[PDB]
Each structure stands twice: as C-alpha cells, then as structure tokens.
C-alpha cells in the first residue's frame, strides 16, 4: 500500500530551546516561515504523495457523485425584516456561496441583492459579517478572500442595491455597528504591520482599535472611538442599544466567556462622534460575561455567566449600577444552559436552552421573566432565527442528524400564537426511517457521564463489524449538537458506517463548569473522554479498534491528534483537520493568544509542564509494544488558513514521517493534504467542502479497505 517514499526533510539540529530547564529540540522550526522556497517545496513534495494515494480508488468518485447529488438541496437562511424590506439568504443546491435576496414583502417576487459568486471564479471570495443601516436603507458587508479572517467592508445602499465608494481595509475580528443617525457604523481594525496581511502571514495580532467610519468619507477620516495601548490583547466591540441611545463595549481579552462591559450615552457626547467617548466602566474586570439582550431607558437586560454556571438573565439598571442591586429576571436553571436569549416585539424574549443537548425554545415576558410559550421542536438543534426588538414576528430554523430542518414561522401580533413551517426541504436518497440517532451517557476514567450521540441503520447486529465515524471537539465552551451532514449519511448509508458524537468535557454542553472541567490543568480530561467514547463504542460492538476512524478540527484537530498518540491501539484511522499541533507555540502566531484561556501559556511553568504532556507536536513516539503501529493519519489544511498557522500540521507531519514513519513496522500512511485558496473552513465554496469530504471518506475507504454500497 505504501507504493510511494516520504519526502526527505532537513532537520535542523540546532534549534534547541530551553523550556524553564526542559529542552526541547524543534528540527523543522523552519516551516514557520511560509513564504520560504523550504517551505513551499515541502509542501509540493506533500501533495505529490498524498494527491495519488486518495485518488486511486474508485471509492472517492463515487462518494463524490454521490455527495454531489445529495447535497444538491435548496438551503434557506431565516427571513429577517431590515426597514420595509425582507431578506433571505439561499442556495439553489450547489452554487458555491449562498446568495442575499431581498423582497419587498413575504408574498413579493425576491430578487438577487448581493451574489458573492459573481466574485471569484471559484467561489473563493466569500461574505464574513454584514451590518443594515437602523432604518434598513444602508447595508455594510465583510468579504474575505480565500478563507483568511482578514475582511474589507464595502457599502451598498439598499434601494437599486447600490454600490457605494466607501471602502475599509485592515478589519479582523470587527464588529459592525451603524449608529441610529444613519451617519456612519463603528467597526475594528488593526495598525499596519510589516510583511504581508492576507492570511498566508503568521504574525501575531495585537493593538486591535475601535472605529467609527463617516459614510461618504474615506476611511482615513475615520473616528478613533477606543483603544488600549497598555493592554495589547483586548479587543473592543461596539454595540447600539436598541433605543440608539449608548453604544455598548464589550472588550474580550482571550476565548473564556467573559467581558468588560463600557457604555457611552450618545446623547451625553460635547458634539457627536469626535475623538474617543466619554466611556462609562459599569463592569470593568474579566470576571463575568455580559450579553446585551434589550434595556427599558436605564435598565439593562443582559445574559450572563456571573455566579451562573448554566446562564441566566439579570437587569442592571445604569443609574443604581451596585451589584447588590441587580435584580435577577430569568434565574439560573440548575441543568439547562441558557444558551441564547432576543428581545422581539417590545417585551416578549425568545430563550433557546440545550437539555442533555437537545434545544428547547420559549417566549418569555420580559417586564417579570415569566414563561408564556413553549415552541415545539423535535429533537435536535435551533440553528437560525430571526426577530428584533422592533420586529413582530420570529423565523427560527431548526436541524437534527436526519433532517436538513424546517424554518418556522411565528406572527407574534396574534393573541393565539400559531407556529408554522415556512419553508422544508426533503434530501430523496436518504430515507430518514432506515436510521436511528440514540443519545447514551458512557462513564469516563473519572467516573463522570459523558453524552454521544450514536446514529446508525436501524436493526445492526452489534457484533462489532461495523466501520465508526467518532467525532469530536472539546473546548471553548461550544457545544457539539445535533446538525444534519449529508458527507456523514453518506458515510452511514453507502460505506456501511455508524456515527458518532461524543460531547466531551471543555464543551459547553453542561454550561461553564463542563468548559472547565476540559481546560488549562484538566485539559486532559477532554483526551480521557474520548478514548472512552471509542472504548464504549468498542465494547458495546458498534465497532472495532481496526475500523473506527476519529475525526475533529482546529481544537479537535488537537483532539484527535493527542488520541493518536496517546493510544494508537484504539484507532484504526485519524483524520485530523486545521489541527493545533505546537502547544508550545501556538500563542506566537496571529489570534493563537486567545486560547492561553483553554490552553495556558508555555511562558508559565506550571503551564509548560501540563502542555508539555500532551502537545502531539512533541509526544510523537514509536508504540513499545511489537504489534501496535499508528493509525493510519490524515492532516489537511490550507495555506490561508491565518486562524490555525499550517505550521502546526507542517511540522506535526515531518515528525511523524520521521520518527514513525520511518520505522519497518509502521505501514500506516501518516500524510498531509495543503488546499491553495482556502483557510480555516469558513466561507469555504462548496466545490471546496465536496472535494474536501471526498478526500476525507476515500482516506478512510483505502485504509480500512471498505466496499461501497450502491
Ligand atoms: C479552532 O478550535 C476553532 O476554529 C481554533 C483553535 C483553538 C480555538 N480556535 C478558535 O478558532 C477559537 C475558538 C472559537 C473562536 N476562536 C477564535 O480564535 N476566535 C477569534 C477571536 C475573536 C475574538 C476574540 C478572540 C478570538
């Protein structure tokens, strides 16, 4: 099977560094430099082997034609209402990026109002965040081209949609906030920097400003609102109130869900918008979160984590700001996370909770807090919605393993609330009622319960036979819920597969004790559950060491890369993609200083030496035991991907060609995949996201040597 040779890689024997009396040896510490002829050779020698090796079999054609017309089903975006006019966005099936539609009312023709795929030829320039004036009439943009958190806004007025002059470069991480005057919109941006800024930089990104740009100006104009030279990590987003009154600051300095929460009275201002504002530091510590959800003149409803693991709604009131005085609206509930929270129709509040992960959405009155409605949902996921404090009505779209989802549709002027399906679409080829989705609790090493979702054809002996797809996250407070993927079915129904999804500790799954029970010193709780997902699966004979495949991405990336190395007898195949490899290093590269929150720093010892235990950069070892190998591994990432540097997947590849790959007994292929014209994963066009999963299943199909089911 290994029909082909690594590439040699120089070994530079010099790069030794001292970690607080530890060295540590980094002989391919030369793939950081992406720009390097080193660099760009490695990489080409990488795809040569890999390229050949997963387009071999006939399986990746027909998992392609099989993806291609299966994911070839319309896909809607809720309405919204902006002014006097509707919005949507939706893809025929296939275009490469979804399109912005406007109607002049629910029963009006639409028509096209933004079409990025008119952007590139290959779909490569994508919508990243958008902002419509207060009055609906102007309409703020992001574009990112090829995958790169890096944005330009651009401008449109609505009526005839427009093109404007208005341009701002250097945005990353932006808010986009217009004020109710209709004069301008605040966002962020970064000083200029040496070398390039277009997403194949590793440079880290520091000094974030706030911004507020005049339309009809140019950005050379624009207003310096906030910035924070003495802390180079804090980032400062601008939000309007939902009277327009006060622009509210919501500075991050890291991932924890936690903020400084300023507030400016816009009326309070000598002249309007001049210089930097005359900011209010009603919260001015990390040790909280404060989400805006609406305020009745100085009483302000926020969500928030303070003393609430799981989330509730408390009212601050600006002119009686004392904790002590804070009322509490909606209480923590002792299980269910309060995931988000809207204000709608003046005083209703539309609550979306996740019970043992499963969403539950309720109306609430927002003068008491009192449940009023419950909307019905079946099991799964709340991945859209629409309705602001002015709006009458709310969309909301829902989604599960087996169903693309439905979009709902609830006018709340009726005194008799009657939710309805808006829109539906049914994937023919896959037959819901052949599969099942079971949720289990599987007990880790600590004796704690951990949740999976296991989905699978109806009536399977569990005697072990079966290929398993187990994928997993675990971190930053995300949880991983139910979400309709047609490359898993595919998996499920035409390679015989079970799926899996373990909801691991550092998700926020069970609120903000479950993140934590996944970070920092407990990072490896998050590697101990998952290597007790795959033995659950094992015993219980849903699957075989020998065919189960582990799966995860950026964080899960990491995941499923320590789980390699950690037990290698567990997995037959790992699939690990724009994966964090260099625990030691990530905080030296772009935005990699925000997950010192989840991670720690290598700076500390005390940090040091719980990273260094578990980094798969620098635990690459040959398995003691005469018949265990590697699984076989696939890296994929792309050379604009600036919120994972490739570096991570560069160097964790050389290693272990080199440390393992190059031993007699592994015959396992350890390979990489680098896309051009990509990044990350958001915005990727679908031509990309089909490619990409067809990779993917044939890697698996080759090394477990699956037949395809027709
Ligand atoms: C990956 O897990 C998910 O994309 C990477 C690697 C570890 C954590 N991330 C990651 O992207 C984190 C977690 C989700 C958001 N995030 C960011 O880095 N976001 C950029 C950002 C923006 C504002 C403030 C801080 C960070």
Not at 309 to 320: A, C, E, K, M, V
């Amino acid at each position: 099977m290994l029909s082909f040779q690594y590439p040699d890689v120089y070994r530079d024997e010099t790069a030794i560094q001292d970690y607080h009396g530890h060295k540590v040896c980094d002989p391919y510490a030369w793939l950081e430099d992406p720009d390097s002829e080193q660099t760009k050779a490695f990489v080409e020698a990488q795809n040569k082997i890999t390229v050949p090796f997963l387009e071999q079999c006939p399986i990746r054609g027909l998992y392609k034609e099989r993806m291609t017309e299966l994911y070839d089903y319309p896909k809607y975006s809720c309405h919204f209402k902006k002014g006097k006019r509707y919005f949507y966005f939706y893809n025929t099936g296939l275009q490469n990026q979804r399109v912005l539609y406007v109607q002049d009312s629910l029963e009006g023709e639409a028509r096209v109002f933004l079409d990025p795929n008119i952007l590139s030829d290959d779909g490569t320039v994508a919508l990243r965040g958008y902002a419509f004036s207060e009055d609906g009439e102007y309409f703020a943009y992001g574009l990112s081209a090829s995958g790169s958190d890096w944005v330009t806004i651009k401008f449109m007025k609505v009526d005839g949609a427009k093109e404007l002059p208005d341009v701002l470069e250097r945005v990353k991480f932006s808010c986009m906030a217009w004020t109710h005057d209709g004069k301008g919109m605040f966002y962020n941006a970064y000083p200029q920097q040496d070398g390039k800024s277009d997403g194949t930089e590793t440079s880290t990104n520091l000094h974030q400003k706030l911004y507020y740009h005049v339309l009809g100006t140019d950005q050379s104009e624009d207003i310096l609102c906030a910035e924070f030279p003495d802390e180079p990590k804090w980032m400062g987003g601008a939000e309007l109130s939902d009277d327009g009154r006060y622009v509210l600051l919501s500075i991050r300095e890291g991932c924890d869900p936690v903020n400084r929460l300023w507030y400016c009275d816009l009326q309070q201002e000598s002249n309007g918008i001049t210089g930097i504002l005359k900011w209010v530091k009603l919260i001015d510590n990390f040790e909280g979160e404060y989400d805006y959800v609406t305020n009745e003149g100085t009483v302000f409803t926020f969500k928030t984590n303070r003393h609430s693991p799981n989330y509730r709604l408390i009212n601050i009131d600006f002119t009686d700001p004392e904790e002590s005085k804070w009322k509490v609206l909606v209480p923590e509930h002792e299980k269910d996370v309060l995931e988000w929270v809207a204000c709608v129709r003046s005083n209703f509040l539309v609550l979306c909770y996740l019970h043992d992960v499963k969403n539950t959405l309720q109306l609430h009155d927002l003068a008491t807090g009192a449940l009023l409605k419950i909307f019905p949902l079946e099991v799964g996921s709340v991945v859209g919605y629409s309705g602001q404090k002015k709006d009458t009505e709310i969309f909301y779209q829902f989604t599960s393993f087996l169903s693309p989802g439905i979009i709902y549709h609830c006018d709340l002027t009726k005194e008799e609330l009657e939710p309805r399906v808006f829109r539906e679409v049914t994937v023919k080829g896959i037959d819901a009622s052949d599969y099942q989705t079971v949720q289990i609790f599987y007990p880790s090493k600590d004796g704690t319960k951990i949740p999976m979702f296991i989905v699978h054809k109806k009536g399977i002996k569990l005697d072990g036979s079966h290929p398993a797809f187990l994928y997993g996250y675990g971190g930053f407070n995300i949880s991983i819920t139910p979400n309709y993927s047609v490359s898993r079915l595919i998996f499920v129904r035409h390679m015989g597969g079970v799926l899996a999804v373990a909801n691991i500790r550092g998700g926020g799954e069970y609120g903000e004790t479950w993140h934590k029970g996944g970070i920092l010193a407990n990072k490896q709780n998050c590697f101990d559950d998952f290597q007790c997902a795959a033995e659950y699966l094992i015993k219980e004979g849903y699957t075989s060491p020998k065919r189960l495949t582990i799966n995860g991405g950026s964080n899960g990336g990491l995941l499923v890369a320590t789980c390699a190395n950690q037990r290698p007898d567990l997995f037959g195949c790992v699939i690990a993609q724009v994966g964090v490899m260099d625990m030691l290093k990530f905080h030296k590269y772009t935005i990699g200083h925000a997950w010192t929150t989840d991670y720690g720093c290598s700076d500390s010892k005390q940090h040091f030496e719980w990273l260094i235990k578990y980094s798969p950069l620098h635990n690459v070892k040959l398995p003691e035991a005469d018949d265990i190998q590697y699984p076989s591994m696939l890296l994929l990432t792309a050379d604009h991907d600036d919120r994972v540097v490739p570096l991570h997947s560069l160097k964790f590849i050389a290693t272990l060609q080199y440390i393992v790959g190059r031993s007699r007994k592994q015959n396992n292929p350890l390979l990489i995949h680098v896309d051009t014209k990509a990044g990350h994963g958001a915005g990727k066009p679908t031509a990309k996201v089909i490619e990409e999963v067809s990779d993917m299943f044939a890697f698996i199909a080759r090394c477990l040597n699956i037949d395809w089911i027709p």
